Amino acid sequence: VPVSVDGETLTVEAVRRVAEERATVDVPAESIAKAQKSREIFEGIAEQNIPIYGVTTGYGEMIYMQVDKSKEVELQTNLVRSHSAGVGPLFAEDEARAIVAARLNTLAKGHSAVRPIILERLAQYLNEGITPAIPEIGSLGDLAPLSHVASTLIGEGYVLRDGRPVETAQVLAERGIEPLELRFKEGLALINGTSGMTGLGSLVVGRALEQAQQAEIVTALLIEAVRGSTSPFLAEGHDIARPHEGQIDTAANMRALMRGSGLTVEHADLRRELQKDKEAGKDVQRSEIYLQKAYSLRAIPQVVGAVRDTLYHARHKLRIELNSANDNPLFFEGKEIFHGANFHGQPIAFAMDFVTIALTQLGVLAERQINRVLNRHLSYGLPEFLVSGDPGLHSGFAGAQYPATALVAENRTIGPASTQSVPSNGDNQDVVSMGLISARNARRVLSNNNKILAVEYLAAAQAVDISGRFDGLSPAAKATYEAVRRLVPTLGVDRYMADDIELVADALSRGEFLRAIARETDIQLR
Amino acid sequence: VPVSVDGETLTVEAVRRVAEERATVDVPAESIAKAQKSREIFEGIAEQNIPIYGVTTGYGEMIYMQVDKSKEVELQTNLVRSHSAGVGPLFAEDEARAIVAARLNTLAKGHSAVRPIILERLAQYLNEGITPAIPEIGSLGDLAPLSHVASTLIGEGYVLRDGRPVETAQVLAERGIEPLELRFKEGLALINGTSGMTGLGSLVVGRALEQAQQAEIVTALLIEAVRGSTSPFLAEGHDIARPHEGQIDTAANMRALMRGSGLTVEHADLRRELQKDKEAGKDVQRSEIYLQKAYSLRAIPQVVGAVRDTLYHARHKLRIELNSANDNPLFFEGKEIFHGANFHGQPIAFAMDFVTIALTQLGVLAERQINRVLNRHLSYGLPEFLVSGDPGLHSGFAGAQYPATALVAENRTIGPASTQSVPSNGDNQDVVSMGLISARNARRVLSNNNKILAVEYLAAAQAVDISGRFDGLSPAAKATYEAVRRLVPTLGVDRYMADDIELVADALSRGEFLRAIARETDIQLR
Amino acid sequence: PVSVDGETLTVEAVRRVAEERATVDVPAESIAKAQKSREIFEGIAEQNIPIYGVTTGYGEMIYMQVDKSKEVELQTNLVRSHSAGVGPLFAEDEARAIVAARLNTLAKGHSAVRPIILERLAQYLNEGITPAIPEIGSLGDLAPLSHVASTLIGEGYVLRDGRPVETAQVLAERGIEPLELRFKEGLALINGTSGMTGLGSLVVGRALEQAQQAEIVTALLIEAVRGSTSPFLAEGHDIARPHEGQIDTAANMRALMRGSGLTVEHADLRRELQKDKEAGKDVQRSEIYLQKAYSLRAIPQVVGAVRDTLYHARHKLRIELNSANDNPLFFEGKEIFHGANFHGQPIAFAMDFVTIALTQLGVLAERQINRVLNRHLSYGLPEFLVSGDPGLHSGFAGAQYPATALVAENRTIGPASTQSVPSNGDNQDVVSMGLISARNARRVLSNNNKILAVEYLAAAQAVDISGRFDGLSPAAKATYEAVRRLVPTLGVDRYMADDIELVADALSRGEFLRAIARETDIQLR
C-alpha cells in the first residue's frame, strides 16, 4: 500500500501482500530509468545483428541456429507460443499473482534489457486484477508456467477469472488495454527465470512461519489443559545451553504464551510434590507423579526450533532470489553480455525441499500431541478419547484422530524433487532443479498440516471444558479457546465431525488464531 | 446391464461399468436369501445381550466398554457420526460409485449379518444416481470414507451432485426415499472394510491396463515412423527364451499392431544392408547403420511386460478382495462369531503401491521415446525437435517435451504408503496399511502418464507427416495417426501447445485410441 | 593442540582430532567450572530430592523413585542395559569424532559431571583407545553413546586394529584403572546428540572438500573441452545473484581456470560465430555454440546451492558442538533445568539436507561425465574417449556405468529426520533419527568420490587424447599430473576397477585440492 518492486528490496511479506491482500505495486522512477537506458543501449547492440543468445539465435539446443534481427518479433513470439505447454491444475489467484510479482521484480532490477513498457504492463495486470491462468505442471526449474503468463501480455493464452480460464484477448478488450508486441529479448526475459517457484515458495514460507506460530499457540493451550511443567521453556536451557536461533525463539513464544497461567506447574512444585509423596515408601518406590512429561510436551523448543531454523534459511534464500536477475543472458553497462545460468532454480529448489521436510516433522509433533490427549493412559486424567458422556456408547474424538494420523503418513510419501533431474532438450538441459515441484510439495504438506492442527485445536478446547479448567487458562489460552469455540461447539454427544474440522482448518489457513492473540493479548510472537 | 453383485463373481471390469458407465446393479435372490436368514439368526444372538464386538461393546480401544442391547441403534448411529471425519477433496462420481459397489458386494456375500434392506438401499443409490460425497483423506486402511457413505444411508452427511456436496436429507425427500435406521452391527459393517481402496483401485488398475495398451499403440506408431527393426518382437525371444506372461503379451500386441507395415525393417534386411555397406572398409570400419536400436525402441516387451505382470497381480488381488467379507466381526452358520481383522487393507495396500511403481516406469519409457524423436542425433534423420520449417526461428516440440520430462520427476517423488503405518487409537491400531493413500498415489501416476503419452502421440503423428511416411504406415498405425489428427492439426509454425496436449490426454483417459483400433482394424489387443 | 572447552570447538577442529590424531586438552577454566558445578550439584543429590536420571527411573520409568543409596547401581544398570547397538562398528575416526563431541559437551559445564569424566575421555583420545561403537540403535544417540560409556567403566568393547576387544584387557594392558559412575554421570555420558553431531562434523567437513574437488575437476574438464568463461564472471553472481555459495563457486571457478590457453572469452566466441555467418535476412545453421550446456555453464548455481546447504549445516554443527546437549541441566542458583536438549532434530534436519545437496552434486558430476563421453556432446573428442580403434575398443564406455548407477542409488536414500516412531511406552513419542540422517549423508558422500573418480580419469584421458596438455592453466596441469601420478593414460582398454577405486580413495584423502594448494598457492573457498 503500495509495495515497491525495485528489484532490490522486495520481501516475502511484501510479495504476500501483493498476492493475498491485493496490495498496489509500484515500480520506482529510478528503476524505470535504469530500464529505459538499458533498453536503449542494448537496442543499439542488437541492432548490429551481433550474436546474442535468444535474441539473434535459436533457443536451448538450437542456439547453433543464427537468426537475423529482421526476425526480432517473430523470434520472441514463437518462443512464448511453443513453450506455453503447461498442463494440470491452474494456480489460484494469490499464487499466480506472487509469480507475476516475482517476475516483475526480477526485470525491474535492470539487468534484463526489457522496455519499461513490460514492467509497466505487468504492474498494470497486478494493480488492475488481470490474473494469468498459470498451469501448475511443466517447469524443470520455470519455462512453461512463465510462458503461459507471457502469453496474456500479448493478448494470447488465458486469464483466470472466477476460477475458470478465459481467452485473454477478450478480457483485454473488455478493459480497454491493447496487447503488447514482444521485441528483442522480451519474450525470453519474461519466461527464463525462477519466478514460478520463487513466487509460490514465498507464499508457502510466509505461511509456514505462521503455521509454526499457530502450532506454538495450540501447544501452549494443550500444555495448560494437561497442566504440564514450564521448566522445558526456561530461557537458560536455550539462550545459554543450546543457542539455536529458532530454538530460542520458540522457547520465548512459549513463555509469553503461557505467562499468567494458573494451570501450569513449575519444576520446583513438581519435585516437592514427589518429595512429600515419597514420604516413606522404601528405597525404590513406584509413584504416580511425573517429574517430566513426554517428549511431545517437553521437546517443543528443539523440534519446532529446528523447523524455524529451516524456515528462516528458506526465507533468506527467497529474499536474495526475489531481488536477483533470474534471467539470461544479462546486460550490464560497459561489459560484454553475460551468458550464464541464473535461471537455474537449484538454490530455491533445495530450500523448498527442506521446507517440506521441516513441515512434515512439525505435523508429526502435532499428531503425537493429539494422540497424547486422546489416550487415557497418557492424557493425565482425561476421559478416554475426550468422551464427555458414556464412553463406548460414544467415541468422542476417536474417529477424528484418524484423518490426522493418516495425514502424517501421506506427508511422509512426498520425496525431495530438487535431486530428480532428467536430461532434456537434446541433452542441453542435462541438469535441472525441479524447484516448482519442490515448492508445490511444500505447499501440500503446509495445507495438510492445517488439517492436523485443526484436529488439535478442537481436541484442546474439548480437553479444556471436559476437565473444567477454563478459569485457570492464561489470557492467551482463553483467547485461543474462545476462537475455537466461536467456530465449533463443545462436543456433547457424538456428531458429524468433517465440517467442524474443515472449519478450523480454514480458520488456520488464514491466520485466525494468530489474529485472536494479537487483538486479545499484549503478546508479540516471534 | 445388469451387473450381479453376489459377493462371489464381481470383476474389476464389472465394477468399472457400474462406476463409469452407470451399469445397473442387481443383488441375486440367493444372496438376499442368505442375508435374510443370517440376519434372523444373528438377531437371535444379539437379542441375548451376548458380547459381540461393535454390537454390544464400544469400538476400537473402547471394546472394553459393554453396551446393553437396549442401545442397539444409538450404538451404531454414534459410530457413523463420530467417524465421519474425512477431509480434503471429494471423490468424483465414478470413484464414489466404485467404492459403494465394492461395499455392497462385500455385504451381499452374506457373512456380515446385514438386513436385506441395506443391500437393497445401497443398490438403490447406485441404480438411481444417488452419489455420496466421499472425502478422499481420512482412512488408515477405510473408516472415515465409508462413514461418510454410511451417513447418506441414514439421511445424513452429503451427496455429491454436480460436483458440490448437498445435504443428503434434502435429496432423499426430493426423491421420495425414506432414510434407514441403523440396527445391530449395520453401521459397523458399512464402514469396517477395504471398499474405499478396493473400489478406487479397481478403476485405477482397469485403466492401468488400458494405459499399457495405448502405450503399446503409440510405441508401435513411433517404431513405424522411425522405421525400426521388428526383430525385438519375434515370438521366439519371449514365448521360448523368457516366458514372462506380460512380456509375451506385449510382444504379441506389438506384432499385431505392426502387421502390414511397409516402413518397418527386418533384421535380415538390416544385416544385408550392413554387409553390402562394409563393401571394403578395412577391418574395423565406422558405419551409419544400426543393426539394433536403442533400448527405448527394443526393450519394450521386457519393460512394458513387467508392468503388465505387476498389473495382472494387482487385478488378481482385487478380484479376490472384491468378493471377500471385508468386515468384522463375521457371521457363519453353526459357528462362533469370527473376531478377526479382515478389514485390514494390507493385501491391496501392497498391490496399489506396486502399481504406482510399475506405472512410474511405464512413463519413464514413454518419456525417453519422446526424447528419442526430438533429438536429431537419435531420431534417425528427423529434423531437430520435429520442426517442419526453419529451426531456431521455430522450436517445434522443444517446449512440449518439458511437461513430459517434469512429470517423470514428479511421479518419482511419490513413495510407497503401505509401509507408513502410524499407531493410533490408544495403540489399538498399532499396524495399518494406508491402502487408500496407495491407491490414490497410483491414480496420480496414472493420470500423469496420460499427459506424458499425449505428448508422445502428438510427436509421433508430427513425426509421420514431417517424414512424409503416412502411406507406409500399417493399418493400425494409420488408425492411430488419424485419431490424433482428428483432434489436433499437424504442427506448422509454432503455436500454443497447452490445449493440444490436454486434448489428447483427455482422449487417452477415455480409451479413444484403444477404440480407434477396435473399429478400424481387426486387431484384438491383449 | 585442540582446545575442548565446550565453547569454541569447530567442525574442522573435530576432524583434526579424529583423522589426524590431533591432541586434545580441556582448559583449566572448563575443568574448573566442572568440579564447581559438580560441587553444588552433589549437594543437591545428597538431600535425596527428585532429579531425573539421578534419583528417578529412566524414560517412561521416571515415575520410579530411587533413593541416593543406589547412586552407582543406577548409572551402571542404565549404561549396560542401553548398550544395545547393532550393525557395523563405526570407523576409528568416526568413533573418535563422537567421543570428542561428548567431551566438548560435558566441558560446557552444565552437566554437573565429576571432572575425571572429562579427564578420562580426553585420555582415551590422547592415547589411542577407541571405543567399538555399533552404528545402529540410536533414535537421535543413547545406544551408540552407551557403548562409549561402557569402555569408561572398563566394560563393553574397544576398537583394536579393526576388531572389538574386551575393554577389560586393553585397560589393564595399558595401565589404566576403570571408573565408577557416580550421580548423573552415566546419564550425562549417553544423553545427547554426540553420535550424529560427531559423525555429521566429519561428513560436513568432507562434503565441503568434495565441493572443492568437484570444482577442481570441473574446471579441468571445462578447459579440456574449450568452454566459455562467461558463465563465471563476477557480475553474474556478485552483482546479479548474491547467493553466498554461488559467489564462492564462481570465484573458485575463475581462480582454477585462471591463465588457461584452451578457454574462450565470450567476446572471442561472438566474433568467431559472427564471422561464420552469411548475410541476407535469414536464419543460418552454425556449428559453433555461443553457450555451452548446463553441466558446463550452470556450475555456480548448482554447486553454490550445495555450498549454501553445507554452510548452514556447518553452522548448526558449530552451535550444537558447543552446546550442553545433555539433560537435566545445572546452573547458578537456578532450579535443575528439565528440558530436551538431547533432541537431535536440529542436526537431523541439517544432515538430511546435506544428503539431498550432495546427491545433486553427484547428479551434476555424472552428467558432465556423460557430456565428455558422448561424441555428439563432447565438442570434438572421440566417442567414449577411445585412443585406438573404437568398437574394437570401448574406452571409458564401461567406466560410465558405475557413475550412472550411483546417482540412482543416492536417489533411493530418503530423509530420516521425519520417520520418527514412538517408543519407550509413549514417553519418546517424537524423535529425530538424526544418526540415520548423518549416515545417509556419509553414504552419498562416499558414493560421490566414486562418481568423481570416474570424472577425474575421464578428464585426464580427454586431455592427452585431444593433445591440449600445454594449453592447460597452472591449476589444470596440477590436477592432471595428480591423476597420472596415480593412473596412466588409457591406450587399449583394460581392467578399470582398480584405477577408479584408486582415484576415489585419493579423493577421499584430499589428494587433489592438496595439489592445487601446493602447486599453485590458489586459495579455494
- Domains in chain C: ranges and CATH: 1-192 (1.10.275.10), 193-525 (1.20.200.10)
| All residues at 6 or more sequence positions from A279 whose CB lies less than 8 Å from its CB, including other chains | none
Q: Pairing state of beta strands C24-25 and C2-3?
A: parallel
Q: How would you class B492 by CB atoms within 10 Å of its CB: exposed for 0-12, middle for 13-18, buried for 19 or more?
A: exposed
Whether C440 contacts C354, CB under 8 Å: no
Q: Pairing state of beta strands A284-286 and B3-4?
A: unpaired
Surface of A (116-175) touching C: CB under 8 A: none
Whether C36 contacts C169, CB under 8 Å: no
Angle between helices C115-127 and C28-45 (to 10 degrees): 140
CA C308, CA B168: separation in Å to the nearest integer? 55
Please judge whether A396 and B66 are an interchain contact, meaning their C-beta atoms are less than 8 angstroms apart: no
CB burial string C158-182: b at 16+ within 10 A, e below: bbbeeebebbeebbeeeebeebebb
Task: Say what the alpha-carbon torsion angle A337, A343, A344, A350 is, to the nearest 10 degrees.
Answer: 130
CA A452, CA A458: separation in Å to the nearest integer? 10
Left if phi > 0, otherwise alpha if psi is -120 to 50, otherwise beta: which for A168? alpha
Whether C229 contacts C265, CB under 8 Å: yes
CA A44, CA A37: separation in Å to the nearest integer? 11
Q: Is C284's Cβ below 8 Å from some Cβ in A?
A: yes
Distance from CA of B372 to the nearest CA of C (A): 14
Greatest C-alpha distance within chain B: 99
Surface of B (435-464) touching A: CB under 8 A: 437, 441, 451
Q: Could you tell me the CA-to-CA distances from C58 to A278, B54, B362, C313, C433 in Å, in that order?
A: 17, 38, 52, 31, 20
Is the preceding peptide bond at A2 cis, omega within 30 degrees of 0? yes
Whether A231 contacts A190, CB under 8 Å: no
| All residues at 6 or more sequence positions from A476 whose CB lies less than 8 Å from its CB, including other chains | A217, A220, A256, A257, A258, A259, A260, A517, A520, A521, A523
CA C141, CA C126: separation in Å to the nearest integer? 23
Q: Which chain C residues are Cβ-neighbours of B415 within 8 angstroms?
A: 414
| Structure-block grid coordinates of residue B88 | 480434503
Whether C189 contacts C145, CB under 8 Å: yes
Whether C26 contacts C122, CB under 8 Å: yes
Cα of C433 vs its chain's centroid, Å: 17
Q: Pairing state of beta strands C64-66 and C86-89?
A: unpaired
| Structure-block grid coordinates of residue C298 | 550452470
| All residues at 6 or more sequence positions from B267 whose CB lies less than 8 Å from its CB, including other chains | B229, B230, B231, B291
| Structure-block grid coordinates of residue A106 | 526480477
| Known catalytic membership, residue C52 | yes
DSSP C112-147: ---HHHHHHHHHHHHHT-EE--EEE-----HHHHHH
| Structure-block grid coordinates of residue A286 | 513406584
Please judge whether C390 and B423 are an interchain contact, meaning their C-beta atoms are less than 8 angstroms apart: no
Matching residue, cell 568440579:
C35
Is the preceding peptide bond at B329 cis, omega within 30 degrees of 0? yes
Select from C283, C376, C390 the Cβ nearest to the Cβ of B392.
Answer: C283
Q: Is C234's Cβ below 8 Å from some Cβ in A?
A: no
Distance from CA of B284 to the nearest CA of C (A): 7
User: Is B316 marked as a binding-site residue?
Assistant: no
> Solving technique for this entry?
X-ray
Q: Is C305's Cβ below 8 Å from some Cβ in A?
A: yes
Q: Could you tell me the CA-to-CA distances from B474 to B265, B386, B511 in Å, in that order?
A: 13, 21, 20
Sign for the pseudo-dihedral over CA of A515, A516, A517, A520: positive
How many CA atoms lie less than 13 Å away from C394 in the CB half-sphere?
9
CB burial string C266-280: b at 16+ within 10 A, e below: beebbeebbeebeee
Matching residue, cell 512439525:
A362
Please judge whether B393 and A422 are an interchain contact, meaning their C-beta atoms are less than 8 angstroms apart: no
CA C512, CA B426: separation in Å to the nearest integer? 57
Distance from CA of B18 to the nearest CA of A (A): 27
Kindly list the partner chains of chain A, i.e. chains with 3 or more CB atom pairs below 8 Å.
Answer: B, C
Residues β-bridged to residue B87: B137
What does DSSP assign to residue B240?
I
Q: Which chain C residues are Cβ-neighbours of B284 within 8 angstroms?
A: 389-392
CB burial string B371-410: b at 16+ within 10 A, e below: bbbbbbebbbebebbbbeebbbbbbbbbbbbbbbbbbbbb
Resolution in A: 2.5
CA C236, CA C243: separation in Å to the nearest integer? 11
Nearest of C371, B221, C426 to residue A290 by alpha carbon: C426
Sign for the pseudo-dihedral over CA of C127, C130, C131, C136: positive
Task: Say what the alpha-carbon torsion angle B125, B130, B133, B139 is, to the nearest 10 degrees.
Answer: 10
How many CA atoms lie less than 13 Å away from A9 in the CB half-sphere?
7
Whether B405 contacts A140, CB under 8 Å: yes
H-run or E-run covering C497? helix C497-507
Whether C416 contacts C437, CB under 8 Å: yes
Please judge whether B284 and C376 are an interchain contact, meaning their C-beta atoms are less than 8 angstroms apart: no
Residues β-bridged to residue A429: A424
**Breaks (C–N over 2.5 Å) after residues, chain A:** 141
Phi, psi (5° rounding) for residue A156? -120, -175
Using DSSP's 3-state secondary structure scheme, residue A131 falls into coil
Surface of B (48-87) touching A: CB under 8 A: 57-62, 64-67, 71, 74-75, 78-79, 81-87
Select from B284, B377, B392 the Cβ nearest to the Cβ of C391.
Answer: B284
CA B248, CA B518: separation in Å to the nearest integer? 21
Please judge whether A393 and B434 are an interchain contact, meaning their C-beta atoms are less than 8 angstroms apart: no
User: Is B298 marked as a binding-site residue?
Assistant: yes
Distance from CA of C283 to the nearest CA of B (A): 7
Cα of C212 vs its chain's centroid, Å: 13
CB burial string A64-97: b at 16+ within 10 A, e below: bbbbbbebbebbbbbbbbbbbbbbbebbbbbbbb
Q: Is B383's Cβ below 8 Å from some Cβ in A?
A: no
Q: Is B409's Cβ below 8 Å from some Cβ in C?
A: no
Matching residue, cell 504379441:
B252
